[PDB]
Amino acid sequence: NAPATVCGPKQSTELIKNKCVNFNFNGLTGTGVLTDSNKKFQSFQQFGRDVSDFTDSVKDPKTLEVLDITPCSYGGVSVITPGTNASTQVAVLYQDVNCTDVPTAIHAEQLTPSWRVYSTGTNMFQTQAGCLIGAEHVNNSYDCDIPIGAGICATYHTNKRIVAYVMSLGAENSVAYSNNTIAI
Amino acid sequence: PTNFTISVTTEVMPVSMTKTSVDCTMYICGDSVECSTLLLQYGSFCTQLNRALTGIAVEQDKNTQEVFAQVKQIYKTPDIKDFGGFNFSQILPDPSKPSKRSFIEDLLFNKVTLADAGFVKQYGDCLGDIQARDLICAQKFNGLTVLPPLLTDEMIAAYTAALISGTATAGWTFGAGAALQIPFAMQMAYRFNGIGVTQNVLYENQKLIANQFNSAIGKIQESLTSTASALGKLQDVVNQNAQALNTLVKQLSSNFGAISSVLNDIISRLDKVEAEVQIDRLITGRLQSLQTYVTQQLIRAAEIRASANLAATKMSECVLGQSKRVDFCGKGYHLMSFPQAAPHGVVFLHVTYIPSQERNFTTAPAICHEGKAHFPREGVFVSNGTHWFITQRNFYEPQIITTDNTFVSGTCDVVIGIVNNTVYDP
Amino acid sequence: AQALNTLVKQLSSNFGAISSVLNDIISRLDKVEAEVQIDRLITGRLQSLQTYVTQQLIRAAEIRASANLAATKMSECVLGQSKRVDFCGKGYHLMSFPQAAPHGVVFLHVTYIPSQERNFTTAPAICHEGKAHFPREGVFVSNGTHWFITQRNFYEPQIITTDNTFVSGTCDVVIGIVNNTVYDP
C-alpha cells in the first residue's frame, strides 16, 4: 500500500462515477461503484480496506483524490409473487431504502426497461421494512397472506392486483365489566 | 399456617431471534465474475443454505404467533384500571402516554440494549461516512442482512394488553369459549378455592390481599428499574446472534491456504489457470464458514423453538387458566399470571399464594365418638391444648367438629392414633 | 425427499476438479495427476454427505420432540382427562381419540364449549340473620326478584338452602353482600 514506482504500459481511462463499472487503480482491479469521498488518508498510501479485507476507498493516481467503492446492488431486494398459474405481476421490496433513493440504490439507468418499470411509480410507499413498489396501499385490514414484514402483508385482488395492508390482530371485542353482574 | 403472602415473580423466556439472510455471491465472491463462474460449478450449496435460513426466519414468526396470538379477540383496555382494589395500572397501557405499551413493558424494552441495530442502518448511512467503519456496514457490504419480524413491538404489546384485559374482565372463561364477565373479587375467590383456601378468607381480607398485590407489583417495578442483568436470556440471544454475524464477517480475511485473502489481488496478479486454484481454495473456505454459521444458527433456532413452545404452554396454562402443576408458574400456589412483552421474548408476572406464620398444633387422624370413627372431609383435626377443632390445611380457621364437617366409616379400634372426643349434632 | 434429491444432484459438481465424472479423470490422466482431482472430488462429496447427515440429525431432533409431545398427549388425553388449559383442544377437555396418519398421529379432541350466556345480577355472599352465607360450588345469581344458586358453567338455578351454602362470620366485612333468606329443611 505504497505509491507505485514501476508500472506497466497500460493506457488510462477517464473516470466514471455513480455507475457499476470495472476499475483498475495501480494494478488493483475490482468491480463496484465509484463516488466522491470525504475520507482523509495518511500520505504515501493508496487504498482503504475493511475488517473483511474489502477495498472500500482508493486514491486516484492522477487527480490525487480518494473515491469510495460501493459494491453493485449491496441492498436486499425481495420480490412478492401471487404465483405462476395465478398471475405474472410482481411487487418488489427494496429493503432498508427510501422510496426516493430507489433508482440510485439499484442503478436504474443501467437496467432493462422492464426492471426500470419497478424502479418508480405511483404505487410506492415506505413500509418500515423498505420501499414497496408494485402494490397499492389499501386501508382495510385482513389476515396475513404474504408476510412483507413490520406489520405489512400482501395478497392478490383484495381486475385482480397486488395490494398491501396492515395485518389485523383479530376481531375487536369489548367486555362490559361490572362489579355486580355475571354471565352464566 | 396462620397468614399468607401474595408474591409476584418474573419469568423471562426467549421467544424469537433475529431473522438473517445471506447472499452467497456477495459473501464468497463479492462482485468478481470469475469467482461467480467458478462458484457456479459447486452446485446447490447456497440453495440449501438459503432454504435453511428461510426456514429459520419463518419459524421465528411462527414462534411469535404461537406465543402471543393464542386468542383472536382483541378485548379493549378498560377505562378504570382498579378492579376491587387491585390496581392493574402498571401492566396495562396508559391512555395519557404516547407509548402504547405499559410501564413494566417500557422498563423491559429499555433493559435490552440491542447493540445489533441493523434497521437503524439504511441506504446512505453506510456511504459517505467520515471514516469510522461500522460492523453493520461490513455485514451489509458482504451480503448479510437482517429481516424485520412480521409482528412489530406495538402489535405484541396490543396482544399482551388484550390478554390482560380479558383476564381482568372475564378471568379464565375467555380461553375456552366466549368471554363471560365476572367481578374480580369473585374471580379471585374462585382462584382461592382452586388453590385450596375457602373464599371467606379472600372476602374477609380483600383489602389486605389487594394491598399485597399492589406492593408486589411495585417491588417488581423497583427490581426492574434498579437491578441490572434481569433480562439475561434475551441479552444472551442478541449477543450470540450479533457475535455470530461478526465472526462470519471477520472470517473473510482468512487466506484458507491461498496466497491472499483478497480476491482482486489473486485475479490481478495471476493468469486464469494459476488463479483458479487460489480462488477454489478461497471458495472452499468461505463455503465452510457459511455452512458452519448455518449449522450453529439451526441449533440455536431449535433451542429458541423449544423455549417458545414452553412459553406458549405457559401462556395457555397460566394466563388463560389456573395451573395445579407444582412450580410450573412460580413458587407457591399459583393464582394468576400476566404476560409482558419483551425484546425477543416474553416476561410472565406470576401471582402466587405463599402461606406463612405457621403454628404448632396437636393433631389426630380421626375422632372416636360413641364407638364410631369420624374422619374430616376437607381439612385436619387440630387441638389448641384443651379443645379439638377442624380447620383447612393451608389456613388456620378453627371450626366446631360437627357431623357435617366429618364422615363416619367404622369403629374406633383399627385407626392408629385415634383420639376420643365429642362430635356436635345440630 | 428434497434432501435426498439434493444429495443426488450434488454428485454433478466438480468441486474445483477438471470434471465431475470420476471415469473421465481416471481415463484421461495418469495416477499422480489423477490423485489431486480425485481427492478434490472426495472432499466435496464427503462435505455433501456430512451436510446431509447434520441436517438429518437436526430434523430428527425436531421430530423426536414432536413425538414426545404426541406421546404425552396420548397418555394425558386418550388415557385420561386433562385439566390443562388448551393442551388438548379449545374448551374443557372431555375425551380424545387417536387416528393413525402417514408418519404421524391425528388426535380428535372432544371438548365442551359453553354458549348462550345470560346476564345475571350476582353477589359474593348472602347476609341472613346476621350471618354471611357463601356458596359451596357455584355462584349466587338473581333473575330480578329472587336469588338463586347455580353452577358456573351451566345455568341451573336452585333454591338457596343451608346445604348449598356454608356460614363463616357476620355480614359486615364482605364487600357487596346482599340481604336475603336462606331456606332450612
Ligand SMILES: *[C@@H]1O[C@H](CO)[C@@H](O[C@@H]2O[C@H](CO)[C@@H](O)[C@H](O)[C@H]2NC(C)=O)[C@H](O)[C@H]1NC(C)=O
Ligand atoms: C396504581 O399505582 C400507580 C403507581 O404507583 C399510581 O399512580 C400514581 O399515583 C400517585 C398518587 O396519586 C401519583 O402521584 C402519580 O403521579 C401516579 N403515577 C402514575 C404513573 O399514574 C395509581 O394511583 C395507582 N392506582 C390507584 C387506583 O390507586
Ligand SMILES: *[C@@H]1O[C@H](CO)[C@@H](O)[C@H](O)[C@H]1NC(C)=O
Ligand atoms: C499527472 O500527475 C500529476 C501528479 O504527479 C497530477 O497533478 C496531474 O493532474 C496528472 N495529470 C496530468 C494530465 O498532468
Ligand SMILES: *[C@@H]1O[C@H](CO)[C@@H](O)[C@H](O)[C@H]1NC(C)=O
Ligand atoms: C430516509 O427516510 C428516513 C425516514 O424513513 C429519514 O429520516 C431520512 O432523512 C431519509 N433520507 C433521505 C436522504 O431523504
Ligand SMILES: *[C@@H]1O[C@H](CO)[C@@H](O)[C@H](O)[C@H]1NC(C)=O
Ligand atoms: C386511508 O385513510 C387515510 C386517513 O386515515 C387517508 O389519508 C388515505 O387517503 C386513505 N387511503 C385510501 C386508499 O383510501
Ligand SMILES: *[C@@H]1O[C@H](CO)[C@@H](O)[C@H](O)[C@H]1NC(C)=O
Ligand atoms: C399477616 O401479615 C400482614 C403483613 O405483615 C399483617 O399486616 C397482618 O396483620 C398479618 N395477619 C395476621 C392474622 O397475623
Ligand SMILES: *[C@@H]1O[C@H](CO)[C@@H](O)[C@H](O)[C@H]1NC(C)=O
Ligand atoms: C414447633 O415445635 C418444634 C419442636 O418443639 C419447635 O422447634 C418449633 O419451633 C415449633 N414451631 C413453632 C412455629 O412454634
Ligand SMILES: *[C@@H]1O[C@H](CO)[C@@H](O)[C@H](O)[C@H]1NC(C)=O
Ligand atoms: C382452646 O379454645 C377454646 C375455644 O375457644 C378455649 O375455650 C380454650 O381456652 C382454648 N385453650 C387454650 C389452651 O388456649
Ligand SMILES: *[C@@H]1O[C@H](CO)[C@@H](O)[C@H](O)[C@H]1NC(C)=O
Ligand atoms: C408417637 O411416638 C412416640 C415416641 O415419639 C410414641 O411413644 C407413641 O406411642 C407414638 N404414637 C403413635 C400414635 O404412634
Ligand SMILES: *[C@@H]1O[C@H](CO)[C@@H](O)[C@H](O)[C@H]1NC(C)=O
Ligand atoms: C349484558 O349486559 C351488557 C351491558 O348492558 C350488554 O352489552 C350485553 O349484551 C349483555 N349480555 C347479554 C348476553 O345479554
Ligand SMILES: *[C@@H]1O[C@H](CO)[C@@H](O)[C@H](O)[C@H]1NC(C)=O
Ligand atoms: C324469578 O324467578 C322466580 C322463581 O321462579 C319467579 O317467581 C319470578 O317471577 C322471576 N322474576 C323475574 C323478573 O323473571
Ligand SMILES: *[C@@H]1O[C@H](CO)[C@@H](O)[C@H](O)[C@H]1NC(C)=O
Ligand atoms: C359498584 O360500582 C358502582 C359504580 O359502577 C358503585 O357505585 C358501587 O358502589 C360499586 N359497588 C360495590 C359493591 O363495590
